[PDB]
Design a protein around this nucleic acid. Structure first.
Lengths: 241, 174, 95
RNA sequence: AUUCCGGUUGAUCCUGCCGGAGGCCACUGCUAUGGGGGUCCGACUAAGCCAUGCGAGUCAUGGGGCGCGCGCGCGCACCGGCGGACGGCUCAGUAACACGUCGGUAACCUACCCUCGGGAGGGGGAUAACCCCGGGAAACUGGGGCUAAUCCCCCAUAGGCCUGAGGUACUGGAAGGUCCUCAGGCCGAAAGGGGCAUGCCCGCCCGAGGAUGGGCCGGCGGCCGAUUAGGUAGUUGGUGGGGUAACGGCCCACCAAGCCGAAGAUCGGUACGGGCCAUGAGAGUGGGAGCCCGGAGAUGGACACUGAGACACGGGUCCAGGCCCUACGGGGCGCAGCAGGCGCGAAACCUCCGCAAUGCGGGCAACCGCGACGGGGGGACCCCCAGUGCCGUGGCAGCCACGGCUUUUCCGGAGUGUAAAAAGCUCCGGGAAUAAGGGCUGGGCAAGGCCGGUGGCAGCCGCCGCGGUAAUACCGGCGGCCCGAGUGGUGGCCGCUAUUAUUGGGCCUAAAGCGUCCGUAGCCGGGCCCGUAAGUCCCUGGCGAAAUCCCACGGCUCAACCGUGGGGCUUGCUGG
């Protein structure tokens, strides 16, 4: 009978969304709590050691991280347990490399290379809105982060809109609304990594969530959850996919 | 529950002492120079698996069934048991003798690199034969269609010499 | 014995060149680390020091073995990054 | 292979059981050459008992001291911080919201981590080390002097909680839940500490949210017994309160008489649950130790302290039970952690090497430690690939001889490999040299009408049946058949068995229609029209972990194994 929290992870019990050889060893790195969930994130050491290849062993990877050479959303990260997730930007300036973290169609996490001009912006989905002391408004975003806005400009922000920001400084630019011609990317579910344009939104009673109907390039229509629909543009992707 | 252990890849017979079966298998063993009945049984088992797959897939509906049909036919082609314009009923006309034809020992005897099957076996096991550039020491390897014309004596091997006495004796047959 | 490079990569974060090469030895035994390093540097214009061979590996019947080496810029970084057992195995260092 | 063969008669057809013939698991007799892979090795009997040594630490970038060196460094114990609640072992108890799946908490907590928004003011105190005396067999422990902090305490301010009255900014499916104003009160922060250098790095406190990890609730599903029929008295509910982190008869006062049950309550028996496994053409039958998820336990049984988290697996208190040291005054320990020994029993390995890989904890880091893990050693555990010679000639009908060839295996070496080894791999030298058994031989059932012996005794025998002096059936010799580094014997599950029958059995005479009738529940129910859409069918969204199953391709000489993809499995649940 357990008397307290876990500190170990068996490699067969690790998330599906990882590229990981499950039978090679017994243990896996257990992720520390932080910006994303366990089902939408991977530790840095796996990126530095397995996805890219700049290290063969964990000691080498840890030395790289402690020398201060990997940035995530423009911030130095030295903990090997730090979780990297969807829409995060990974940067290596000694090489000039810049990647965006996204999901596959199977549901696994991949690195898409991008340019230095687009490695300065990151979108955030608004998940909730609160009033906080001083009659101010707090926006609670999809990576668990928070941002403050005033009363006067409160109606410009809603709970499935998207906000594009300069990341190390966190300055807002180009609010994108949830609408009926908006361009959407899917993050979870059976239709993960499909894209298209919103066609319709349906609501249900007694706590059941809302569903969105989408049209893809070829004209095929499909459905998913509104909380799984990530707005990235009005009619054209503001970022590369 | 319980975890799964590794299981045999051959099936034994239902009755041990039936005369017709004993005669058939005696002939096969003698003629292909096999060491035991396990080998014959494992080739029989290969064939039976192919047949069961064809029986299951025949008159079935869906996308995966089509994919698996094409996979099965491609595999039999690549192994050298069916041609390309082969249909799925042609799988049910195959015999164990085809699978016995497709093994190294038999092919090395049929090309003329040895005088006999037992000699072919000894050549392979001692290391005198190469396939597609690579030494293989297992006389039941099941050569592929696009590896057959590359089977020769190993580079470093006495028989590579045009004047070896046993090689002279071997060639004298042809 | 002859050598044939097959892939070079540059690691700027660790500061080294990762070199995958083939070795050819027909009718001969598996060559020694000394000879392999000698020919490697003599060919690619490297300093013998600052260079470590991780492994030479031979396969079942091939006469073609594979090898992996690491070329460093400075011996300080070399010794701070690499573990002592390969340095002792090559001979750069005494226990 | 969707299978049959022997046995009741002087002969026949039936019913029906026994036996043969296949697979997997455990013990065992005889025998045994090699390499590789894997989730195997005191679970069945004693969750029985012991000795020795190990399994949990780390930080000079928190503080004082001492020593060894050269105001700089190296070490020793001490104060202090974090961790020690994970890892590992076992299945005794438990028929239960324990487990599985879908949901819920607007009824709750959360140190380490992330983001944003804000703070670090003013004063005090003691004590370990150290010094002087000691006590006691030890386990342990007294007095006096002295001194630090990220040790401890106080004041204030921020902040937190309760209640009453208003307003209406936010979220949501739904609010006094959050926000604003007022009022009456209770509790009540912080280390401006450290390093560098002339601003940066590591840390401290408050608030809002997330993450991680848990607590609680509900719907549906999962063994046997009637030679167990009535059970329940805080029991079922209500009002008002207490307590809890939180809802709740969880507990209390008062008011009532409800709750469960022949569709099996209660009682008893047995048992950790699942993913899975074995078997079979399938339908099905049986099991659930080893790997993953969950649950419970630490001699038996209870109770608490500290902490974010325990009523604590290497900690505490008591009773029972046992064992040990003792100067007899008193003290100490439970091997269901690793290795080792005893015993129990049909039945289960080295008192080995290492932190090089995977991970955990601590640390700015550099790094340290880890009987986890990795590596080897022993063992007829499971699986894959091979060997114990080949060619030709003469003679027989597989063998002797003659003449040649090869070296997987064998012996001996050099490199590579490896944390170090070892094995494996490349090459070199020698040399047919170094390597077959077990059961059966009357019929079922493949194989002798051959010899010697014994003599209804001795013996064989799954079943049928042989043997009584001409033995194809006993013992042995010689031959032959099956399988083959394996082959036989004993016990268990499946199949055989349509001998449990939904698919798919039977009841005149073979086992089997209640002595006859009436009827309760349940099961089965005539024809047409209208409606509904609960069952039923199609399509689409969210779930049903990974491993294990099938297929193809790719990497280990192929293969077993591993990886990348496509399907299936989870007996199903839920929104449209």
């Amino acid at each position: 009978a357990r008397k307290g929290p876990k500190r170990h992870l068996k490699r067969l019990a690790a998330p599906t969304s990882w590229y990981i050889h499950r039978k090679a060893y017994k243990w896996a790195v257990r992720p520390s709590p932080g910006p994303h969930s366990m089902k939408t994130s991977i530790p840095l050491i796996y990126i530095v050691r397995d996805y890219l290849g700049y290290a063969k062993t964990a000691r080498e990877a840890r030395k790289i991280l402690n020398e201060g050479k990997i940035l995530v959303d423009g911030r130095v990260r030295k903990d090997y347990k730090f979780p990297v997730g969807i829409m995060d930007v990974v940067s290596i300036p000694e090489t000039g490399e810049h990647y965006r973290v996204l999901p596959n169609r199977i549901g696994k996490l991949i690195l898409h290379p991008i340019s230095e001009e687009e490695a300065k912006l990151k979108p955030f989905r608004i998940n909730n809105k609160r009033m906080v002391k001083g009659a101010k408004v707090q926006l609670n975003l999809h990576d668990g982060s928070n941002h403050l806005v005033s009363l006067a400009e409160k109606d410009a922000y809603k709970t499935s809109y998207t906000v594009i920001m300069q990341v190390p400084e966190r300055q807002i630019v180009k609010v994108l609304p949830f609408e009926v011609g908006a361009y959407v990317f899917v993050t979870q579910g059976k239709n993960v990594a499909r894209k298209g344009k919103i066609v319709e939104v349906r609501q249900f009673p007694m706590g059941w969530p809302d569903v969105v109907t989408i049209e893809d390039e070829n004209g095929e229509l499909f459905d998913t959850l509104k909380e799984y629909a990530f707005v990235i543009g009005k009619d054209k992707p503001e970022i590369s996919l | 529950g319980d975890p799964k252990r590794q299981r045999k890849k051959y099936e034994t017979p239902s009755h041990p002492w039936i005369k017709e079966r004993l005669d058939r298998e005696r002939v096969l063993k003698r003629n292909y120079a096999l060491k035991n009945k396990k080998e014959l049984w494992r080739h029989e088992t290969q064939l039976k698996e192919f047949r069961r797959r064809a029986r299951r897939l025949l008159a079935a509906r869906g996308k995966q069934a089509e994919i698996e049909r094409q996979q099965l036919l491609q595999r039999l082609y690549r192994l050298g048991l069916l041609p390309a314009d082969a249909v799925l009923d042609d799988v049910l006309s195959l015999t164990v003798e085809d699978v016995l034809e497709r093994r190294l020992q038999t092919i090395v005897y049929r090309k003329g690199l040895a005088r006999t099957m037992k000699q072919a076996r000894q050549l392979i096991v001692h290391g005198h034969i190469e396939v597609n550039g690579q030494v293989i020491r297992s006389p039941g390897y099941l050569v592929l269609r696009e590896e057959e014309d590359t089977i020769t004596y190993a580079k470093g091997s006495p028989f590579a010499k045009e004047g070896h006495p046993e090689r002279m004796v071997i060639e004298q047959a042809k | 014995m002859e050598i044939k490079v097959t892939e070079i990569r540059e690691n700027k974060l660790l500061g080294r060149k990762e070199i995958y090469f083939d070795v050819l030895h027909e009718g001969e035994p598996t060559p020694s680390r000394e000879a392999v390093k000698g020919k490697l540097v003599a060919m690619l214009d490297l300093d013998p020091n600052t260079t470590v061979i991780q492994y030479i590996r031979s396969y079942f019947g091939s006469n073609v073995s594979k090898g992996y080496a690491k070329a460093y810029e400075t011996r300080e970084r070399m010794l701070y990054i690499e573990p002592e057992y390969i340095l002792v195995r090559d001979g750069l260092v005494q226990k």
